[PDB]
Amino acid sequence: LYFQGHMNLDLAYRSFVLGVAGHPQVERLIKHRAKGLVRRYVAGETLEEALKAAEALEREGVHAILDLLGEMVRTEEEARAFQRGLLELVWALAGKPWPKYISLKLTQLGLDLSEDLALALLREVLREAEPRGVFVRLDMEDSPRVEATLRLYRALREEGFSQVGIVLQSYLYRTEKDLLDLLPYRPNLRLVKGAYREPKEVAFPDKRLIDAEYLHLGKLALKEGLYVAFATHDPRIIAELKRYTEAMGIPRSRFEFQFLYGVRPEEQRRLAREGYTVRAYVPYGRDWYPYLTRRIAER
Amino acid sequence: LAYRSFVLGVAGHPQVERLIKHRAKGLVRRYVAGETLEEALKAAEALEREGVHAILDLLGEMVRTEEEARAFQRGLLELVWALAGKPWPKYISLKLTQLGLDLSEDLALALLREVLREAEPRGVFVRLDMEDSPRVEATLRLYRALREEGFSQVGIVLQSYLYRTEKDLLDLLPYRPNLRLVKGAYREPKEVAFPDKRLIDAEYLHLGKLALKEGLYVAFATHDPRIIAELKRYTEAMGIPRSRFEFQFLYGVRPEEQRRLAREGYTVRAYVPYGRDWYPYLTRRIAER
Numbered sequence: 001l002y003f004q005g006h007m008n009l010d011l012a013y014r015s016f017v018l019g020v021a022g023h024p025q026v027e028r029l030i031k032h033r034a035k036g037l038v039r040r041y042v043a044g045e046t047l048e049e050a051l052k053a054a055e056a057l058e059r060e061g062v063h064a065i066l067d068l069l070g071e072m073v074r075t076e077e078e079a080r081a082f083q084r085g086l087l088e089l090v091w092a093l094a095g096k097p098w099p100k101y102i103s104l105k106l107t108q109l110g111l112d113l114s115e116d117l118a119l120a121l122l123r124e125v126l127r128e129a130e131p132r133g134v135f136v137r138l139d140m141e142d143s144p145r146v147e148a149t150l151r152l153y154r155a156l157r158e159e160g161f162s163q164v165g166i167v168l169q170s171y172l173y174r175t176e177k178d179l180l181d182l183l184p185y186r187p188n189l190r191l192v193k194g195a196y197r198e199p200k201e202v203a204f205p206d207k208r209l210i211d212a213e214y215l216h217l218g219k220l221a222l223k224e225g226l227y228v229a230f231a232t233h234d235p236r237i238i239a240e241l242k243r244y245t246e247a248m249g250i251p252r253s254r255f256e257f258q259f260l261y262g263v264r265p266e267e268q269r270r271l272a273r274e275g276y277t278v279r280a281y282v283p284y285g286r287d288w289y290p291y292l293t294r295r296i297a298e299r
Numbered sequence: 300l301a302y303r304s305f306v307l308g309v310a311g312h313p314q315v316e317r318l319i320k321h322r323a324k325g326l327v328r329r330y331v332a333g334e335t336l337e338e339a340l341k342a343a344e345a346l347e348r349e350g351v352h353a354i355l356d357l358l359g360e361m362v363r364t365e366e367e368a369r370a371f372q373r374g375l376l377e378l379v380w381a382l383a384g385k386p387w388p389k390y391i392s393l394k395l396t397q398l399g400l401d402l403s404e405d406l407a408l409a410l411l412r413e414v415l416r417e418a419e420p421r422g423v424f425v426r427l428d429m430e431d432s433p434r435v436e437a438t439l440r441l442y443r444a445l446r447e448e449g450f451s452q453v454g455i456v457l458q459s460y461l462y463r464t465e466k467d468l469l470d471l472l473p474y475r476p477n478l479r480l481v482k483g484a485y486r487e488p489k490e491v492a493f494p495d496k497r498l499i500d501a502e503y504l505h506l507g508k509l510a511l512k513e514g515l516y517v518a519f520a521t522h523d524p525r526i527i528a529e530l531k532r533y534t535e536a537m538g539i540p541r542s543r544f545e546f547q548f549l550y551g552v553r554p555e556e557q558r559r560l561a562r563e564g565y566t567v568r569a570y571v572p573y574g575r576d577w578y579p580y581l582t583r584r585i586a587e588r
């Protein structure tokens with residue numbers, strides 16, 4: 001496609017990586033010749049490999065968020081099969097001596113098929129998770145899914161669940177109002193910049209404004225007394241949040257930093273040694289190749 | 300950067316000053332109203348005809364003695380007395396060092412109290428401009444003291460580049476301060492102020508939105524189009540009425556934008572200097588852009 005008289009470069013780049021990755025040969029060679037590279041970013045194909053990765057993180061003083069990967073869920077049957085995978089994860093984490101935290105996307109529980117289905121399946125996950133001390137994060141997907149995601153969060157909180165948190169994205173205009181609307185829930189928040197392609201009508205097109213909004217929302221949340229997980233790799237933002245929290249006397253027990261597994265691992269450890277709570281987000285599952293393709297196909 | 304050096308360098312020469320005063324009156328009058336109060340009032344009338352309001356700023360040589368402080372205060376009193384009965388919004392700005400702050404806090408407070416006593420009954424609003432970081436604490440002490448004495452038509456300026464500003468803002472909330480928010484104009488070390496323009500801008504937006512959400516009246520004193528556009532978007536999206544905030548610009552800086560925002564129904568003011576000592580102010584205007 002074209003944008004403003006010139007080829008859409010974002011589109012061109014995405015389409016090339018997707019075409020190249022989809023070629024049977026390059027996939028064959030990535031699986032065979034690039035095993036070490038892949039395992040820096042994805043634990044493995046199995047729950048067993050994920051747990052070993054979490055143990056290896058914990059030995060270095062960094063906590064784990066376990067993220068089950070799966071093919072895009074398109075039928076009720078697939079949503080139930082994915083929930084099954086989530087339940088095995090919850091049951092497997094149950095004994096572990098370290099903090100237990102899983103992440104999931106509501107579309108994988110059939111949100112697009114039925115909001116009622118997603119809620120039913122999610123509630124069954126929380127029923128297992130909460131007595132086991134397993135925290136469940138509802139990852140935030142693209143803008144058309146925000147209202148439903150917030151609805152399901154409020155529903156579960158109102159049914160008595162507390163071991164559940166949400167993600168807010170600093171690139172959306174609507175996020176400050178969402179945050180303010182949610183305050184009576186005293187939500188546990190993960191703050192991210194935002195990973196989806198959104199039109200200028202719903203999201204700041206300017207990286208300076210996305211970054212400014214991230215800092216504004218983080219500081220607002222901190223001053224409101226909310227527990228906030230700063231999910232960012234941006235050194236400017238990390239340095240400012242460290243300075244701000246120290247200046248404001250905000251205890252280390254009231255916030256944390258989160259990084260993708262294998263991204264700035266040296267900084268993950270440094271922040272850990274400085275006394276901050278740090279987690280790495282650890283994907284695992286049979287669908288790692290399409291997943292890594294999409295991460296590459298982004299920026 | 301090379302343009303700045305050249306300008307500041309050439310500006311100090313007496314033959315250059317003679318040329319500007321005789322041959323570049325149109326340039327001078329873009330940025331300063333003139334040497335006299337009479338000229339400042341005429342400049343304010345001209346702005347008002349375009350729907351833009353005026354902030355009147357008396358310029359004088361740096362105050363170094365009590366006598367000089369009292370002389371400056373007299374200039375401010377004449378301004379206040381002259382603004383009385385003008386039909387349009389009356390707003391003056393002052394720097395506390397010009398009222399002898401560095402000589403004595405007691406002196407600056409006494410001189411300022413007298414100005415506020417003459418100003419309030421005449422409907423003249425008085426802004427305490429914020430100077431460098433070593434003066435912030437005294438400025439806020441004087442502000443709080445006068446608020447507690449019952450003065451209400453006095454406001455303060457906070458600068459987004461200082462680490463201390465958010466705490467200052469939160470500390471001042473019980474006073475319900477009328478605020479002008481600026482980026483900050485002084486050379487401050489990395490220990491006290493964000494070195495990175497991206498962070499100064501981010502803090503400006505953060506403080507502005509905090510202040511609006513707390514229900515404070517805020518004057519956004521900035522010429523930055525990215526910030527102005529974001530503040531317009533935010534206030535609209537949040538349903539903040541145009542009666543609860545304003546934009547302020549230096550006189551002669553983006554005058555078309557001033558008129559445009561006025562036509563869009565925003566409160567807009569231009570900061571208009573006048574007085575004998577206008578020549579160093581003018582040079583900083585030329586050098587800046």
Ligand SMILES: *N1=C2C(=O)[N]C(=O)N=C2N([C][C]([O])[C]([O])[C]([O])[C]OP([O])(=O)OP([O])(=O)O[C][C]2O[C](N3[C]=NC4=C3N=[C]N=C4[N])[C]([O])[C]2[O])C2=[C]C([C])=C([C])[C]=C21
Nearest residue numbers: 139140167192193194195231232233234258259260263281
């Ligand atoms: N899960 C979510 C989610 O639920 N919703 C969502 O929209 N996004 C999710 N994210 C992804 C984030 O939104 C975001 O895309 C990433 O975190 C990346 O943004 P970041 O790191 O804040 O800032 P940036 O891209 O502007 O990068 C600025 C600087 O950071 C450093 N950087 C970034 N990426 C790097 C890197 N350095 C080395 N390698 C890599 N790959 C650079 O210096 C760069 O200049 C999401 C994120 C996270 C962390 C979690 C736990 C969960 C979700």
Ligand SMILES: *N1=C2C(=O)[N]C(=O)N=C2N([C][C]([O])[C]([O])[C]([O])[C]OP([O])(=O)OP([O])(=O)O[C][C]2O[C](N3[C]=NC4=C3N=[C]N=C4[N])[C]([O])[C]2[O])C2=[C]C([C])=C([C])[C]=C21
Nearest residue numbers: 428429456481482483484520521522523547548549570588
């Ligand atoms: N009085 C105060 C005060 O009491 N204390 C104080 O420290 N500073 C005062 N200011 C000055 C401001 O702090 C500040 O220096 C100026 O307002 C300039 O900052 P601004 O305009 O927010 O942002 P910038 O310089 O980074 O510029 C960014 C963009 O803005 C546009 N711009 C800026 N300057 C321009 C210009 N466009 C044309 N011409 C000029 N000269 C550009 O697009 C640029 O990319 C102070 C300011 C004001 C307004 C008042 C009323 C009172 C005080």
